[model samples]
Target: MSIVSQTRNKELLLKKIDSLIEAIKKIIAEFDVVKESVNELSEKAKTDPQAAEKLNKLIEGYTYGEERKLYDSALSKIEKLIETLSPARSKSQSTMNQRNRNNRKIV
Candidate 1:
């Protein structure tokens, strides 16, 4: 019964970790989209300097304005998630204790 309970707890923790990892990946994908948009503007800027200049100016404005807001929101969410999850401390403590005991055995 104790072993089963321990196994269930570990599984639940793993599921939470997996779910949060996926959420983080989704946020990362949005960042990639923003990066690709910037790269495309860079390439356009090279070929048509005037158009590029205007476009870049627009992008620069966005970088200072809406982009900052978007990044701030994403970062805020991630920080909140980290604070809420607070799982690593327990997981690491358990692993360290296990390792200490395991090291005492020959195997």
Candidate 2:
């Protein structure tokens, strides 16, 4: 591969990575909202089993093969991203903090 081609590929990859990062962040934020909604529903489910059963029926009817698979895949991706990104982000933050401290020193 030529140097120009390699540089272009790197730039394209960086853009894609940035887009994925934004998507992942949005997904993570939306997942938290879903969790909150689930918690509220769970509380109601515990208190009102009759209501819960009806809701379960509706959800089960609505969530067929495609929807179920989509939800499962999204959850799986999010779990993997958290596992992968969390430590990496912490290490990055730590390195940045150390760099800031170094810059502040009387050198």
Name the candidate that leads on lDDT. 1
Writing each residue's lDDT as its tens digit, candidate 2 over 1-107 gives: 59999999999999998997798778768767865776677567767879788767655554454764686687787678787866654444434454343345576
CA error at residue 42 for candidate 1, angstroms = 1.9
Off by more than 4 A, model 1: 1-23, 77-81, 84-107
Residue-wise C-alpha lDDT for candidate 1, range 1-80, written one tens digit per residue: 79999999999999998997798778789877977987787787778879888887877886787766886687788777
Q: What is the C-alpha local distance difference test score of each model?
A: 0.78, 0.70
Q: Which pairs clash in the backbone of model 1?
A: none
Worst 10-residue lDDT window for candidate 2 reads 93-102
TM-score of 1: 0.43
Query: Distance from true position, residue 64, model 2, in Å?
Result: 14
